[PDB]
């Protein structure tokens with residue numbers, strides 16, 4: 001099973017986990033390899049407006065002040081229980097990659113000379129995130145609760161902060177802040193693989209423990225998806241209080257968040273609940289693949 | 290606050306050396322698919338590798354693939370659950386992920402050389418002695434004292450254990466043979482050297498933060514770990530040289546090399562040397578490890 005130490009390296013019980021780990025290691029990147037020189041001149045020489053600067057400043061402050069505990073759910077919920085070698089090394093590889101993201105955002109903060117502060121426009125989004133997480137009452141000690149923890153991680157990595165990612169990518173859409181866009185783009189490429197792995201693990205985990213997939217179990221996951229959309233909606237509401245974004249309207253970001261939330265439910269093996277046919281931000285589709 | 294408490298903010302760092310070492314460790318990232326093994330295949334088929342040299346490599350690789358099947362076990366089950374400090378945890382998690390690349394690299398060597406699987410190899414007594422010692426060791430990370438000893442033990446596992454087989458595998462590229470395999474071993478040791486540096490630094494910091502665990506009996510248990518590590522490599526060397534001789538490599542200098550780096554690891558843990566081998570006996574191996 002997923003929860004037992006491997007007897008030998010081969011044959012693989014979960015070959016897809018090896019293949020995805022190999023693909024994830026090939027996408028390895030480090031924060032120091034990204035050219036930020038043009039972002040600095042973009043920032044100093046008035047190419048970034050005063051309102052665009054507050055958006056970037058407040059989003060990066062939200063990034064550096066949230067999810068400070070890198071890989072917490074990998075190290076404390078999934079890795080202790082999934083002892084199978086190929087699955088454990090997948091999860092360990094995902095968790096290590098999250099550390100690169102945290103260093104990348106810290107290097108963006110410092111390269112742009114952003115001042116330290118505890119306050120930003122999105123404190124209500126962070127507090128709403130912590131409240132939602134407290135009410136989920138994530139219990140990995142039961143087979144049923146571990147399944148729900150896996151589904152929750154798919155929304156954390158595949159929906160949470162994606163509204164902020166679209167806003168940061170709005171700059172590289174027009175040739176501005178391209179180094180920051182590369183950080184976000186490669187972060188999204190990582191999270192897409194993490195979502196793919198955690199969702200596949202979720203589907204396999206439900207087959208191996210079929211008595212956890214009850215009528216309320218599925219309903220609780222649909223609630224998770226709708227709570228993630230409600231959370232991203234709150235981010236969008238707070239973000240547009242700062243001013244407008246060139247070529248990007250609040251209503252279409254909310255539709256894009258609903259579109260990718262339906263993708264995550266499909267990846268978990270559940271049905272769509274918003275039925276947004278096309279992603280309204282087609283300039284992003286290359287980065288979302 | 291301490292090594293065992295979650296960080297409140299990312300910066301300032303409580304343990305900046307751990308971030309710096311993680312950054313340096315991630316810059317050394319490599320994947321098994323990037324090493325060229327084509328010339329190792331021709332070396333193997335076209336008689337450049339003698340019958341005795343094939344038995345050395347075949348048996349060592351079988352020992353590698355059949356042991357440490359659970360990658361990062363001590364990281365994931367002993368240290369990461371307890372070291373909650375962000376920068377230290379991400380360091381250990383980064384080390385643990387890198388061990389998965391080593392396992393895939395050695396499996397790729399096996400498959401590229403078309404080596405047959407069987408369960409028997411020449412070092413079964415060495416592996417059994419290793420597993421017996423660890424099983425009758427009581428690795429106990431749940432106590433303040435035992436966690437320090439767990440850290441010292443990992444430093445000998447990663448910095449001493451199997452280094453005799455590493456010298457034998459690296460002896461081939463010295464003569465222009467099995468160079469792709471040589472890269473695998475060399476890049477694996479470059480990783481392990483960083484893991485040893487981090488785990489040893491963590492051990493020293495952990496002893497400062499829990500100073501009352503450092504008694505006479507505590508150090509004696511660590512010095513025994515060192516002497517048992519040398520005894521294990523000694524059994525490996527005795528078993529390996531029963532297969533024949535190695536061109537340019539004598540058993541006694543391999544035994545001196547193991548005693549030399551065992552003293553290096555004790556110094557890295559902050560303890561005193563017990564073998565006093567002044568110079569590295571294998572100057573060609575220190576050079577390729579830079």
Ligand SMILES: [Cl-]
Nearest residue numbers: 141142143144
């Ligand atoms: Cl249960």
